[PDB]
Amino acid sequence: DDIVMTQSPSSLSASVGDRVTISCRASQSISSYLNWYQQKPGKAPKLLIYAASSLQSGVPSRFSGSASGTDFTLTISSLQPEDFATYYCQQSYSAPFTFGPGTKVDIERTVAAPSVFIFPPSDEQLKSGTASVVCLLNNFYPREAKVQWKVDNALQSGNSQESVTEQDSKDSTYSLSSTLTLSKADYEKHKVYACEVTHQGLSSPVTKSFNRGE
């Protein structure tokens, strides 16, 4: 049996002292053959709960698990700083053993709009036949953000990549870089390069733009 484990929600934000509940659903009956793991960035998972409701040795008592049919819940009774992490459920009822896709519990804070910056390709790079245009979204919260590239007002698709930092240790924000890659010849065909940022901290999307060659 190929058992699919779903988790809801995919992400949530909480504050220290909050009661936090995370949900897991199996695509078929798995009895109580259900475990919960915690994972932080760069680190291996850690076992929290096994057999739906058994607390693993050494795990603080604020963690608990419960089961109702195909529905499973992990509860943290009063969230502590060390609990911000991604949480995975895992079924041991049928091979292949399968994991849920994870619920990331991040730090709740006030909305913070990104500060947006755009960088043209460097003269150095353009000599080598390629143009990288970079859009930086600095120190925003929450994580959801949309970056749209526009070249002479034409919306770009398929030629950008973006990556994101982990939540900042000092101000609990995220930052994000989006890179638009064009050949030099394509870069030279257009004039206005723009990054349009949509984020709930902005009442209107913010556009940062330049004219090529200025």
Binding site: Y37, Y50, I118, F119, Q125, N138, T179
Partner: protein, 222 residues
């Protein structure tokens, strides 16, 4: 105190094989089992299989049967995972984990630190380092962003510092992205007082050990 120590990162070509080790300590190895679980970059967790140290019996993930072999050496308390006929989407961090025998429900109670295995046909190549120059289009109310684009290298990793580690506040070094070319790229940025620009020096220190490439790039306003 239970510990599982895995071997170091590996770079392999498609069609090759890899063998990762997992050295156990702090418990009676022959009484337990070892499971292997992998995590592709940015993805979730995938069980690969199970071995019992006492009798050497294995259970493998169907999507890997025929390509994966798990063994243990009970004389050295070491577990091994061999994966053959490697493909690019075998790129992952591979974990070993201890399984407790004779439990109604199997669970993974201690995990190794992980081994990155990168599978790629790309040749080792050092990065080009390009400035992300501060201008009035990276100036925001008395602060300015600048940075370094570290483009087209293989394999991971690169390190980036600013001003030899003396500059840390306001730095963001982004995770690398794998481009369609098979080469990685990443950016490192820092925000600084805009009045500092003409009066202070900003150097990104880029080190790519695999290609023995080291670059210090001064980023100057436009």
């Amino acid at each position: 105190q239970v510990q599982l120590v895995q071997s170091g990162a590996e770079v392999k070509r498609p069609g090759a094989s890899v063998k990762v080790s997992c050295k156990a300590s702090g418990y009676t190895f022959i009484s337990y089992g070892i499971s292997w679980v992998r995590q592709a970059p940015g993805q979730g967790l995938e069980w690969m299989g199970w071995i019992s140290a006492y009798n050497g019996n294995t259970n493998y993930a169907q999507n890997l049967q025929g390509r994966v072999t798990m063994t243990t050496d009970t004389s050295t308390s070491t577990a091994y995972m061999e994966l053959r006929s490697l493909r690019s989407d075998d790129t992952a961090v591979y974990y070993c984990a201890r399984v407790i025998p004779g439990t109604a429900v199997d669970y993974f109670d201690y995990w190794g630190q992980g081994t990155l295995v990168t599978v790629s046909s790309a040749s080792t190549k050092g990065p080009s380092v390009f400035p992300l120059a501060p201008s009035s289009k990276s100036t925001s109310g008395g602060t300015a962003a600048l940075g370094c684009l570290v483009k087209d290298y293989f394999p991971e990793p690169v390190t980036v510092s600013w001003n030899s580690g003396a500059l840390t506040s306001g730095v963001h070094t982004f995770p690398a992205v794998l481009q369609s070319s098979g080469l990685y790229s990443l950016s490192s940025v820092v925000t600084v007082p805009s009045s500092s620009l003409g009066t202070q020096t900003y150097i990104c220190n880029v080190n790519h050990k695999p290609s023995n490439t080291k670059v210090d790039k001064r980023v100057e306003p436009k």
